Amino acid sequence: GENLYFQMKHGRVFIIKSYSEDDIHRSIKYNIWCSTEHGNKRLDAAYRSMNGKGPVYLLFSVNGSGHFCGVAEMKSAVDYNTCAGVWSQDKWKGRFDVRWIFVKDVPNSQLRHIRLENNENKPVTNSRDTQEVPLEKAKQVLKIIASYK
Numbered sequence: 001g002e003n004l005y006f007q008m009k010h011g012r013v014f015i016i017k018s019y020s021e022d023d024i025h026r027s028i029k030y031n032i033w034c035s036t037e038h039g040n041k042r043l044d045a046a047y048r049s050m051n052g053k054g055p056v057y058l059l060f061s062v063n064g065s066g067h068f069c070g071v072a073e074m075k076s077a078v079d080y081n082t083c084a085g086v087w088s089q090d091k092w093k094g095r096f097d098v099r100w101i102f103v104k105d106v107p108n109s110q111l112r113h114i115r116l117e118n119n120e121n122k123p124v125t126n127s128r129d130t131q132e133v134p135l136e137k138a139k140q141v142l143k144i145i146a147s148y149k
């Protein structure tokens, strides 16, 4: 048969890279995240220009792990003045709401043939934190993540 679900012109998709496995667990538990100052600025702009016309998806991967670990949607703008030190390292300023919609490990081998024309045609699996994913490649990534078993 066929699965044409992801094949939608409104939506923006970003890679999230975490050094910390603990912080992934905490994000899933409490449905919150924080990036760097410049990453927060990037995500906040995308969320606030989307005006709720479509989702901002976050594709999570722990640095060095060899796999993605799940997918969340942004659910709020960035609040830059929040309690410090709630994450494994005290390196972060602020907080935004997410909603994890998918938690499972997807090996990089399933995804490394998808390349990002906006990042020198490097594999999507070689991205840095808050690398944006072109929509047509994001649809391919989401289908692979959803279909993996």
Ligand SMILES: O=c1cc(C2CC2)[nH]c(=O)[nH]1
Pocket: 017, 018, 019, 020, 023, 033, 034, 035, 036, 087, 092, 129
């Ligand atoms: O390793 C990390 C850990 C976090 C915590 C959520 C703040 N954020 C990030 O971008 N990388």
Ligand SMILES: [Cl-]
Pocket: 133, 134, 135, 136
């Ligand atoms: Cl695009």
